[PDB]
Structure 1
Amino acid sequence: SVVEEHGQLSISNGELVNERGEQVQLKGMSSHGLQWYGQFVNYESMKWLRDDWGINVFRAAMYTSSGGYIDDPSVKEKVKEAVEAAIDLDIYVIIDWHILSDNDPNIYKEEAKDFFDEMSELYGDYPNVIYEIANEPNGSDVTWGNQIKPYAEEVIPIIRNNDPNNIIIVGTGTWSQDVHHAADNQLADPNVMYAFHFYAGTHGQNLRDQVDYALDQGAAIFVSEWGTSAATGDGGVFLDEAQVWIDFMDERNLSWANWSLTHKDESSAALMPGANPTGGWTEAELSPSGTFVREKIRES
């Protein structure tokens, strides 16, 4: 239903729009690392998210380091499973090259080019796919102008040779918070968005003003990862601040994916220890974070 109705997404005047030019907002869940919690990524759990939570996007978080793709590339097959389920369920899917400890996206750029060539060759003629080429560039030595933008300018051509206009989300500096610098020196591709990530444990009023500054430069922003916890993914659940961000994203037509779909014992995890990896969760099998996120998507 979702993908049949909205079809080809594109960027028009800095807004995500459907194929009829109408604004569309995607709301869904991100997996945790596929090398650790890949059992929660399957057709049945994604269908349950679609039908019971109302998701219209799913994000496959393929870490590169931390025992991820570079050490064991077999995790790429779990990304393929998620994309295939999204196609079968008629929802959108984000393929996330999930850099983090490997803080400069240039570290594994050759592997990234080969991976995105493969994924775009396979899925480049489906409208469901959104490519997220560098989760969270970070470090004082990794800047938009010197490291991130040039990396994007090598990887985007690889994707575009196979898929000329599906959306590409490009990470920003300081763990995808520095949308101000990216917005002042935007990429040329017309179907790019910049990632903005937040955690509700951080007081967010200036970060909201910074997202607004970027939107004011005509940059499109996709909140491809956010949590109800502190920045570590743990340390408490901050639902008052999360609601302020939810309302902010609705007013600005910002699409988002919540972190994350796992039973890991940390506050940002959506599930409790006994949650079935194939879905069907009762109220008690959702954590306080999962209950809130589910409510937000159901309300939408």
Structure 2
Amino acid sequence: MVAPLSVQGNKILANGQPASFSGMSLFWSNTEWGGEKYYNAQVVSWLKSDWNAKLVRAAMGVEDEGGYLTDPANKDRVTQVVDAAIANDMYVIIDWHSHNAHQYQSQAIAFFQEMARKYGANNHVIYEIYNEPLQVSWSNTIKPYAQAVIAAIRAIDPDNLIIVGTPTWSQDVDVAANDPITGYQNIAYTLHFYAGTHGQYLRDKAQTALNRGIALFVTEWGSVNANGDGAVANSETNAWVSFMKTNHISNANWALNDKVEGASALVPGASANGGWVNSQLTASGALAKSIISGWPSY
């Protein structure tokens, strides 16, 4: 049984102590976007057995073409991954993979209510309600949306973590920390980085947020450039890894996918059902597996 997770100040706790978990993000769930083939039980069990992953993220597209708003089959793919995470005793992040979620509050509420009713009794579930807000106000745009969605989840699932996206593609955790979400337990805040583009400047905003007493979760990170492509930046990735290990920050690498781009963990044609030998991982994938499998035990 995975531990129920909670927040106290800047820490996510398991069994009364800071704990952190490392794994992979799936790519966009969207129909015809390629990554959908990896949303299955075999992939989830392989990530556990071969990568020693403790976490998987289901990245459910929303207003993007082929996403949940126009194609509900996206949610069936999410369900497959959630069921498989629970069966494999892995945490699972249910991600509303939107850039504009404040426009779709009632849809988000209805979706997270269903997810909470069905899955809320499990320790495994982590709700991520707003992937990557753009250059929009924390106080006036994101936080009202978050308050409403959190109220709806908490009425059903009083405990399990809810992770809230932050301004500028989930960079401005320092801004969120000056106006945190109150009145509900076990709320944390999203930080996203790509080590080819982001370094100490972004680490400093993260440190500021931590010092101001909010907890961070890296629901998405890449070893490559911020556009999802380019060379693996080994040195800067190791810097980010140390930062996350020091501060007990959970992390999901982008992405378990076979598209030709730097962020893909897999070569094109890597099997939809797992079993990948090392020579079928990309430089990004091999580094991701190394970080995940070497993540602290707790």
Relative to the length of structure 1, the TM-score reads 0.95
User: In the alignment, which of 137, 144, 147 is matched to residue 141 of structure 2?
Assistant: 147
* Alpha-carbon separation, structure 1, partners of 2:294 and 2:123: 26
User: In the alignment, which of 203, 207, 223 is matched to residue 202 of structure 2?
Assistant: 207
How much has 1:239 moved relative to structure 2? 1.5
* Alpha-carbon separation, structure 2, partners of 1:171 and 1:273: 31
Match of 1:198 in 2: 193
Counting only pairs closer than 5 Å after superposition, residues 102-251 of structure 1 correspond to structure 2 as: 103=100, 105-139=101-135, 142-188=136-182, 189-251=184-246
* Alpha-carbon separation, structure 1, partners of 2:226 and 2:234: 14
SS in 1 for 2:17: coil
User: In the alignment, which of 17, 37, 40 is matched to residue 39 of structure 1?
Assistant: 37
Match of 1:294 in 2: 289
More helix by share: 1
Match of 1:89 in 2: 88
One-letter code of the match for 2:44?
M
* Alpha-carbon separation, structure 2, partners of 1:203 and 1:124: 35
One-letter code of the match for 1:60?
A
* Alpha-carbon separation, structure 2, partners of 1:234 and 1:294: 18
Counting only pairs closer than 5 Å after superposition, residues 259-298 of structure 1 correspond to structure 2 as: 259-298=254-293
Distance of aligned partners of 1:248 and 1:275 in 2 relative to their CA distance in 1, 3 Å threshold: same
How much has 1:274 moved relative to structure 2? 2.6
What whole-Å deviation, never above 9, does each CA across 1:247-296 have from its counterpart, x for those lacking one? 11111111100000000100011000131111111111100000011011
What whole-Å deviation, never above 9, does each CA across 1:169-218 have from its counterpart, x for those lacking one? 00000000000110011001220000000001114111111100000011
Match of 1:50 in 2: 48
* Alpha-carbon separation, structure 2, partners of 1:81 and 1:45: 11
* Alpha-carbon separation, structure 2, partners of 1:250 and 1:56: 15
Match of 1:71 in 2: 70
Any stretches of 5+ residues in structure 1 without a counterpart? none
How much has 1:38 moved relative to structure 2? 1.4
Distance of aligned partners of 1:203 and 1:97 in 2 relative to their CA distance in 1, 3 Å threshold: closer
* Alpha-carbon separation, structure 2, partners of 1:22 and 1:52: 27
Any stretches of 5+ residues in structure 2 without a counterpart? none
One-letter code of the match for 2:181?
L
Distance of aligned partners of 1:174 and 1:269 in 2 relative to their CA distance in 1, 3 Å threshold: same
* Alpha-carbon separation, structure 1, partners of 2:272 and 2:155: 37
How much has 1:236 moved relative to structure 2? 2.2
One-letter code of the match for 1:271?
L
One-letter code of the match for 2:55?
V
* Alpha-carbon separation, structure 2, partners of 1:158 and 1:169: 14
SS in 2 for 1:29: strand
Relative to the length of structure 2, the TM-score reads 0.95
Q: Which runs of 4+ in 1 moved over 3 A?
A: none
How much has 1:299 moved relative to structure 2? 1.7
